[PDB]
Amino acid sequence: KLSAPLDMLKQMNESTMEQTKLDELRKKMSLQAEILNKAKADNDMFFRLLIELMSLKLQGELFKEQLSKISKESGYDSAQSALIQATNSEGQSPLQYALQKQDFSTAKYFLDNGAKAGPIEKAVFEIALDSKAAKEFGFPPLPPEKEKLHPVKNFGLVLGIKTTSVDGTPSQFGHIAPTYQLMTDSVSHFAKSHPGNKNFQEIANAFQFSNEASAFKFSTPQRNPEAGNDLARRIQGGELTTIPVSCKGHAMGLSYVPDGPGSKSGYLVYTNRGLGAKSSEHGTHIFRIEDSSKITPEFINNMTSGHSNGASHDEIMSQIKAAAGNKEPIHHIKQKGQKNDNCTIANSKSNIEGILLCQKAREVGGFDKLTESDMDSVKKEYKEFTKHMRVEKVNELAKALKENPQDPDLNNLTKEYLKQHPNADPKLKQTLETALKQASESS
Numbered sequence: 001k002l003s004a005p006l007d008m009l010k011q012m013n014e015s016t017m018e019q020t021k022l023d024e025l026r027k028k029m030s031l032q033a034e035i036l037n038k039a040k041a042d043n044d045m046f047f048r049l050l051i052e053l054m055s056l057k058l059q060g061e062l063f064k065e066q067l068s069k070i071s072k073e074s075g076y077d078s079a080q081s082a083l084i085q086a087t088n089s090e091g092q093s094p095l096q097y098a099l100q101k102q103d104f105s106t107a108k109y110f111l112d113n114g115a116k117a118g119p120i121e122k123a124v125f126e127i128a129l130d131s132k133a134a135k136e137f138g139f140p141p142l143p144p145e146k147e148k149l150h151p152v153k154n155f156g157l158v159l160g161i162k163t164t165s166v167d168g169t170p171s172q173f174g175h176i177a178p179t180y181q182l183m184t185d186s187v188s189h190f191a192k193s194h195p196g197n198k199n200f201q202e203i204a205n206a207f208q209f210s211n212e213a214s215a216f217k218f219s220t221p222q223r224n225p226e227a228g229n230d231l232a233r234r235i236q237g238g239e240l241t242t243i244p245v246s247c248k249g250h251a252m253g254l255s256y257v258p259d260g261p262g263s264k265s266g267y268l269v270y271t272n273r274g275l276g277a278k279s280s281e282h283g284t285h286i287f288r289i290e291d292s293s294k295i296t297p298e299f300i301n302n303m304t305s306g307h308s309n310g311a312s313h314d315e316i317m318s319q320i321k322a323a324a325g326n327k328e329p330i331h332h333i334k335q336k337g338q339k340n341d342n343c344t345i346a347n348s349k350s351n352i353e354g355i356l357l358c359q360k361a362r363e364v365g366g367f368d369k370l371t372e373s374d375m376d377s378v379k380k381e382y383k384e385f386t387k388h389m390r391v392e393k394v395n396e397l398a399k400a401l402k403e404n405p406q407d408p409d410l411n412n413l414t415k416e417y418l419k420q421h422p423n424a425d426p427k428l429k430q431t432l433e434t435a436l437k438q439a440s441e442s443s
C-alpha cells in the first residue's frame with residue numbers, strides 16, 4: 001500500500017540524531033553493560049546471527065523474538081543495546097547494513113527495536129533510496145534539490161576530510177552522478193593544464209565519453225541500454241574506455257585500456273579499496289584481455305546499473321571475472337583501504353594508476369617488459385596527478401572560505417583538514433591557515 005514507506009520515512013526522521021548524541025547514548029549503554037559485569041559483547045558473532053536471521057525472512061513477532069534471542073546470545077543486554085552498539089568489521093551499524101543491502105523491511109524492524117539514525121545511516125539511506133528496490137517498496141523519488149554535491153562532500157571526498165555539516169550531512173557517501181562529474185572535471189583540468197601529457201589526454205577523453213554516455217541521475221544511469229552499446233563499441237574500436245561500476249551502496253573502479261587503435265586486445269583494470277574486498281586485495285587489479293568481445297553491452301549496462309538493480313558485490317565481481325575469461329590478474333597495485341564510505345572518488349581515482357600502468361606497459365611493448373624505472377615513473381606520474389587535484393581543491397576551499405568567511409561548514413572543513421592532515425605539504429597548510437585567520441578578521 002502506502003503505509004509501509006510513509007511509516008519508514010517517519011520513523012527514520014524521528015530516530016535521527018547528531019553524531020555526538022548517538023556516541024553519548026552508546027557510552028551510556030556501555031556504562032550499563034559494565035555495571036552489569038556480564039559476558040562481553042561479540043559484534044562479529046552478532047552480525048553472523050543477524051545475517052542468518054534476516055535470511056529466514058520472518059514476520060514481525062518472530063523477527064523481534066529472534067532478534068532479542070540472538071542479541072542475548074552475543075552478550076548484549078537487549079536487542080536495543082545491540083542495535084545501538086554493534087558494528088561489523090566494515091564499521092556499519094545493523095541499520096546501516098540493512099539500508100545498504102536495500103533491505104527496507106529489515107531496517108524498519110530495526111527501527112521498531114530501537115535502532116537510531118546517525119548521519120551515516122541517513123546518508124546510506126539517501127543513497128539506497130535511488131534504487132529499483134526503493135521504488136518497489138513505495139518510496140517517492142529523491143527531491144531534485146539533493147542532486148547537487150554538498151560542499152562538505154565536495155571537499156571531504158577529495159581532500160579526505162572527515163566531518164559533518166551543520167545540517168547533518170556527513171562528508172562520506174555520495175551519489176555517482178555528481179562525484180563522477182567531479183572526477184571527469186578533475187581529469188580534464190589536469191589534461192588542460194598539461195596538454196603535452198598524451199596519457200592524460202586519452203584519460204580525460206575516456207572520462208568525458210563515459211560521463212556523457214552513462215547519463216547518471218543520482219545513482220541510476222538514464223541511458224540503459226544505449227550507454228552499454230556506446231561503451232562496448234568504443235571498446236571494440238580500440239579506445240580507452242572507463243566503466244562506471246557499482247553494487248548495492250558501493251562504487252568501484254573499472255576501465256579498459258586497449259593495445260592500440262582498432263586492436264582487439266588490452267587490459268581490464270578493476271579497483272576496490274573498500275567494502276567487498278579483502279584487506280590484502282585492497283587496490284587495483286589488472287586483467288589481460290586478449291579478446292575484448294566478451295566485454296558485452298549487457299555487461300557494461302549491468303556494471304553501470306549495479307547499485308540501482310540491487311546487484312550484490314559478488315554478482316558484479318563474477319561478471320567482471322567472466323568478462324576477463326576467469327583468469328587471474330597479472331598485476332596488483334596495493335592501495336590503502338577505505339571504510340565507511342562508498343568510495344565514489346577513491347576507487348575511480350585509484351583506477352587511474354592502473355590505467356597509467358597499462359599505458360606504460362603498452363609503451364614498452366608488454367607487461368613482461370616493464371622495468372623498475374617504468375613502474376616508478378608511472379607511480380610518480382599518478383602522484384603528480386593526485387597532488388594537482390589536492391592543490392586545486394585546497395585553493396578552492398581557501399577561496400570559498402574568504403568569499404564566505406562566516407560559513408560554519410567552510411570554516412569547520414578548513415579546521416578539520418588542518419587538524420587531520422598535519423603532515424600535508426606546508427604551503428597548503430599555510431594557505432588554509434591564512435584563509436582561517438582572514439575568515440576571523442571579519443569580526
Ligand SMILES: [Cl-]
Pocket residue numbers: 312313314315
Ligand atoms: Cl556480495
